[PDB]
Design an enzyme around this catalytic site. Structure first.
Site, PDB file in Angstrom:
ATOM      1  N   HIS A 156       1.089  -0.803  -0.486  1.00 17.95           N
ATOM      2  CA  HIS A 156       0.089   0.391   0.050  1.00 17.95           C
ATOM      3  C   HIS A 156       1.053   1.308   0.144  1.00 17.95           C
ATOM      4  CE1 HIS A 156      -3.087  -2.841   0.967  1.00 17.95           C
ATOM      5  NE2 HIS A 156      -4.551  -1.842   0.405  1.00 17.95           N
ATOM      6  N   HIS A 171       1.701   1.328  -5.935  1.00 19.94           N
ATOM      7  CA  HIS A 171       0.571   1.433  -6.080  1.00 19.94           C
ATOM      8  C   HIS A 171       0.155   2.653  -7.186  1.00 19.94           C
ATOM      9  CE1 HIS A 171      -3.801  -0.816  -5.098  1.00 19.94           C
ATOM     10  NE2 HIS A 171      -3.403  -0.409  -3.800  1.00 19.94           N
TER      11      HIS A 171
END
Ligand SMILES: Cc1nc2ccc(N)cc2nc1C
Ligand SMILES: [Mg+2]
Ligand SMILES: [Zn+2]
Length: 313
Positions: free
Chosen positions: A68, A72
């Site tokens: 994350h 991403h």
């Protein structure tokens, strides 16, 4: 204004494909994003001074977690780009603007833990936001950065165009909450099949942007197999850290988060492709035929995971 971003030849060609990987050179990612804004939207959509300032503040507010992370963000935004470029005429100027910005912003200040772990820990964000905890937070961080001096990339829009784009970004970011995706797609399924799906109806557009957001978000499963497989290690690294934290609160985590149960990962991925990914890319391909290369890549990667189980890798 006559300053075009360009890319080396291999990227200039591959960036247009759904399975493009943005590469290991962090410093190229801002110019990759701006490249995509300029072709999806125009060299005009944003004042470059404000866009770059905005891009660098967003980068700064992504944390150094295995998955994350800033990579991403740019990767989800590149999937949205591929979609918007293969469905040119179906989207408004405002939606093209908003959606690339929603994708870049969609996981702002993520710590690598799920909504569930926030609720069991009793994190303050979980008192502030009882459902879609992280996603209401990601939208809040997005508004915060839009309001920093010199960061309002939308400043040129009308009061009402400004309200419309911020509403597109909010619905787009809330949709990334995978607990919301199942009902959203079941409804798109029925609407498409019974024949009542209608892109002039705003509530139907909202649903279709939501499914696109889920598709872009899961796009790891639509890459070439070595990219899918190496991303899955990052994904599981966060999952096992969260399961360790569960164990620390005295809760046995689900096996998918238990680092003592790695043997079950290939079967866990099968469930995930069958329950989530394949249905997602199927309904997307029905609503938006040109997005079929994502369904095909997703099916190819299910077959690579079946091969892992059968011990042929
Ligand atoms: C590859 C992958 N596997 C997953 C397994 C479980 C879960 N909740 C989300 C997942 N998301 C991706 C992108
Ligand atoms: Mg998220
Ligand atoms: Zn995400």
């Amino acid at each position: 204004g006559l300053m075009q971003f360009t890319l080396p030849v291999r990227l200039c060609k591959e960036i247009e494909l759904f399975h493009f990987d943005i590469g290991p050179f962090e410093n190229m990612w801002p110019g990759i994003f701006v490249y995509m804004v300029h072709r999806s939207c125009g060299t005009s959509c944003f004042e470059l001074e404000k866009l770059c300032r905005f891009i660098m503040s967003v980068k700064k507010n992504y944390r150094r977690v295995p998955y994350h992370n800033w990579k991403h963000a740019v990767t989800v935004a590149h999937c949205m780009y591929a979609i918007l470029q293969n469905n040119h005429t179906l989207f408004t100027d405002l939606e093209r603007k908003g959606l690339l910005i929603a994708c870049l912003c969609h996981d702002l200040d993520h710590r690598g833990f799920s909504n569930s772990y926030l609720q069991k820990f009793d994190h303050p964000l979980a008192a502030l936001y009882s459902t879609s905890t992280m996603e209401q937070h990601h939208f809040s961080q997005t508004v915060s950065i839009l309001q920093l001096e010199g960061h309002n990339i939308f400043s040129t829009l009308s009061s009402s165009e400004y309200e419309q784009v911020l509403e597109i970004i909010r619905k787009a970011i809330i949709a990334t909450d995978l607990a919301l995706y199942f009902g959203n797609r079941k409804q798109l399924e029925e609407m498409y099949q019974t024949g009542s799906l209608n892109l002039n109806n705003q509530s139907h557009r909202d649903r279709v942007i939501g499914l696109m957001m889920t598709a872009c978000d899961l796009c790891s499963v639509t890459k070439l197999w070595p990219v899918t497989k190496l991303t899955a290690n990052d994904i599981y690294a966060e999952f096992w850290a969260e399961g360790d934290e569960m164990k620390k609160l005295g809760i046995q985590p689900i096996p998918m988060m238990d680092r003592d149960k790695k043997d079950e990962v290939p079967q866990g991925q099968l469930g995930f492709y069958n329950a989530v990914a394949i249905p997602c890319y199927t309904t997307l391909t029905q609503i938006l035929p040109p997005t079929e290369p994502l369904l095909k890549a997703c099916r190819d990667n299910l077959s690579q995971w079946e091969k892992v189980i059968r011990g042929e890798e």
